[PDB]
């Protein structure tokens, strides 16, 4: 679990969005596993606007942060799950690191701000949904 709070927006994994997220929907994209909903309170986070390929992410299944080198946002095949059919997920960045299903939502940050959130994993892999291209999140 986890979310980004920026301005009057809440960014979450689309597969973990609540009834309230869908009732306050701003934008969603199944191909990216992202959903953004509106909030009444002002958010705590800053979004990075950069091309960093190193950063640190929070891994809830270890209660720890880990440094990572990650690939540029790209179209990557993701196997079928209970949430989606087998498909290409876009704007996804892979890295070597520990991740388990419940780790989705952990934030990845670089020196400039929030880069994205955990969205996929594998045997010693962790994948992040990029948010740096969503310029409208901070107008």
Ligand X SMILES: Cc1ccc2c(ccn2CC(=O)N2CCC[C@H](C(N)=O)C2)c1
Distances (CA, A) of 37 to 6, 52, 105: 11, 26, 15
> What distance in Å separates the CA atoms of residue 51 and residue 65, rounded to the nearest whole number?
21
Tokens of 106: 């952990």
19 is a catalytic site residue:
no
The set of residues, in sequence order, having a beta carbon less than 8 Å from that of 41 and lying 6+ positions away, is: none
Q: Please report whether residue 105 would count as binding ligand X according to CB under 6 A.
A: no
Among 20, 100, 111, 136, binds ligand X (CB under 6 A): 100
> Which residue in 15, 29, 65, 98 is the catalytic one?
15
59 is in an annotated binding site: no
Q: From Zn ion, ligand X, none, which one binds at residue 110 (CB under 5 to 8 Å depending on kind)? A: Zn ion
44 is in an annotated binding site: no
Distances (CA, A) of 98 to 4, 65, 67, 101: 21, 10, 11, 11
Q: Which residue's CB is nearer to Zn ion, number 66 or number 84?
A: 66
> What distance in Å separates the CA atoms of residue 24 and residue 19, rounded to the nearest whole number?
9
Task: Pick the piece of the chain touching ligand X (CB under 6 A) from 21-29, 64-72, 99-107, 130-138.
Answer: 99-107
Kindly identify the residues of this chain, within the stretch 8-47, that bind ligand X according to CB under 6 A.
15, 33
Q: Please report whether residue 84 would count as binding ligand X according to CB under 6 A.
A: yes
For residues 100 and 61, is the Cβ–Cβ distance under 8 A?
Answer: yes
50 is in an annotated binding site: yes
Q: Which residue's CB is nearer to Zn ion, number 52 or number 56?
A: 52
Q: Which chain residues interact with ligand X by CB under 6 A?
A: 15, 33, 78, 81, 83-84, 89, 99-101, 103, 119-123
């Amino acid at each position: 679990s986890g979310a980004i709070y920026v301005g009057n927006y809440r960014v979450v994994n689309r597969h973990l969005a609540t009834h309230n997220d869908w009732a306050n929907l701003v934008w969603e994209d199944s191909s990216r596993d992202l959903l953004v909903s509106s909030t009444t309170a002002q958010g705590c986070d800053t979004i990075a606007r950069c091309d960093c390929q190193t950063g640190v992410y929070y891994c809830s299944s270890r209660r720890k942060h880990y440094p990572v080198s990650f690939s540029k946002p790209s179209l990557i095949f993701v196997e079928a799950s209970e949430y989606y059919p087998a498909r290409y997920q876009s704007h996804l960045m892979l890295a070597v690191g520990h991740s388990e299903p419940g780790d989705c939502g952990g934030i990845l940050r670089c020196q400039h701000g929030v880069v994205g959130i955990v969205s996929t994993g594998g045997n010693g892999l962790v994948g992040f949904a990029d948010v740096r291209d969503l310029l409208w999140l901070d107008e």
